[PDB]
């Protein structure tokens, strides 16, 4: 009784299945992010002491802009800044929302969580990774032409390794997705595993693992955004 | 005998192999990255903040493998491909 | 119910840890940044006042 996967609120539409729980978690994360954005919009000031939300947002912007400037000049690739900031905040909020105590007994002795981190669903990570993939490949095409960019990526650094280079490209999105998936998917299992204990024993491993999971979510958001920025930099260098 | 029995035994062995390999890789890689971090901090103490950005990047690239392996291990033992 | 009780106690432990050992340093960092911004604004204002006084002295001399 571990019930791995088994999405809830699953509904069909236009002949396509949809995981209601994943959509709901993503929508809650987006609502939190948009609320933070519009709360900054109402309290963004340069002539006074900044608020906490302004400090958080500008720290994120400073970090992402520093990474971009280090890798690819902000003149060439300005959009990468909002892209990376959005990716980071989205992943971080979605991962950290799992820390809340929303696990219970699903009337059958198996743990059920009202909110599950959307990154534990392959659809979420695939959407993010493929959006990034298309984004920086389009950027590279614009930078180096329709035919120039594919030739450059195939040739890589030494032409004699042309096969591996191709694989590397295919590994860029997959590595971005699976990594995140795993780092969050494992969490969804461990908590479930820890739910097999009695409460008086379940409380302690649950606390330890969920603290470590807070750390893991922070690191995963950081890595995903940084690798996105650096893939843009690689794809946009002449 | 029951085909699912041997299929599940093979799935459990394969998942064990996946998890063991992932654990070996992640443990050793994290140890090596942490060794680099500790040595760098010992040499020039004021680089502590400066070295954390690459270190975690390394931790991101190393642990990935393990966690990716972990995911597939679940697929082996919870939704076994080829199960009859 | 037992699962809920156990995970709720775990979350209480997490919250206690956060408030005891994570909230203080983070709030200190935020306060330091706010005070740095306020000090920068104060330096800007007093530099404007200094330039005004310098112009006044130039007019006098």
């Amino acid at each position: 009784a571990i019930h791995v996967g088994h999405h809830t609120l699953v509904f069909e539409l236009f002949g396509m299945t949809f995981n209601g729980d994943t959509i709901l978690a993503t929508a809650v994360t987006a609502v939190i992010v948009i609320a933070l954005a519009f709360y900054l919009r109402a309290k963004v000031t340069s002539t006074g002491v900044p608020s906490g939300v302004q400090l958080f947002w500008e720290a994120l912007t400073i970090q992402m802009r520093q990474q971009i400037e280090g890798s690819i000049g902000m003149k060439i690739a300005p959009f990468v800044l909002p892209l990376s900031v959005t990716i980071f905040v989205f992943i971080l909020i979605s991962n950290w929302l799992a820390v809340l105590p929303l696990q219970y007994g699903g009337a059958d002795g198996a743990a059920a969580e009202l909110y599950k981190a959307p990154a534990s669903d392959i659809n979420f990570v695939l959407a993010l990774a493929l959006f990034v993939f298309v984004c920086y490949h389009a950027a590279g095409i614009w930078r180096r032409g329709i035919v120039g960019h594919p030739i450059k990526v195939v040739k890589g650094h030494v032409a004699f390794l042309a096969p591996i280079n191709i694989v590397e490209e295919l590994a860029k999105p997959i590595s971005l997705a699976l990594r995140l998936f795993g780092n969050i998917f494992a969490g969804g299992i461990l908590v479930a595993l820890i739910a097999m204990f009695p409460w008086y024993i379940q409380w302690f491993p649950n606390a330890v693992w969920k603290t470590f999971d807070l750390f893991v979510g922070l690191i995963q958001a950081f890595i995903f955004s940084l690798l996105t920025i650096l893939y843009f930099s690689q794809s946009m260098e002449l | 005998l029951d085909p699912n029995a041997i299929i599940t035994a093979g799935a459990l062995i394969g998942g064990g192999l996946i998890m063991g390999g992932g654990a070996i890789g992640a443990g050793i890689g994290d140890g090596i990255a942490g060794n680099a971090l500790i040595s760098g901090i010992a040499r020039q103490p004021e680089a502590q903040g400066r070295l954390f950005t690459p270190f975690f990047i390394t931790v991101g690239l190393v642990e990935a493998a393990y966690f990716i392996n972990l995911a597939f291990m679940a697929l082996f033992v919870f939704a076994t491909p080829g199960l009859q | 119910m037992s699962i809920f009780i156990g995970q709720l106690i775990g979350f209480a432990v997490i919250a206690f840890i956060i408030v005891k050992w994570v909230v203080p340093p983070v709030r200190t960092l935020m306060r330091n940044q706010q005070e740095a911004v306020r000090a920068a604004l104060a330096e800007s204002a007093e530099a404007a006042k200094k330039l005004a006084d310098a112009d006044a002295m130039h007019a006098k001399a």
Partner: protein, 63 residues
């Protein structure tokens, strides 16, 4: 069931992400960049004003 199989959810989540991106593109990053540039310009102006006050006070007695 195989949880590595993408589902229609892929699209829905994507759309939500795009929406957030839009907001972050037009209500978080532009204002924040403007604020940071204003702060940098303010620091430069403060330094320039201090330098101007110093040189002016020197010139007052020099002239």
């Amino acid at each position: 069931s195989n949880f590595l199989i993408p589902n229609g959810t892929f699209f829905a989540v994507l759309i939500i992400f795009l929406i957030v991106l839009g907001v972050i593109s037009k209500w978080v990053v532009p204002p924040i960049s403007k604020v940071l540039a204003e702060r940098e310009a303010m620091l430069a102006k403060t330094a320039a004003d201090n330098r101007k006050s110093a040189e002016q006070v020197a010139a007052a007695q020099a002239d």
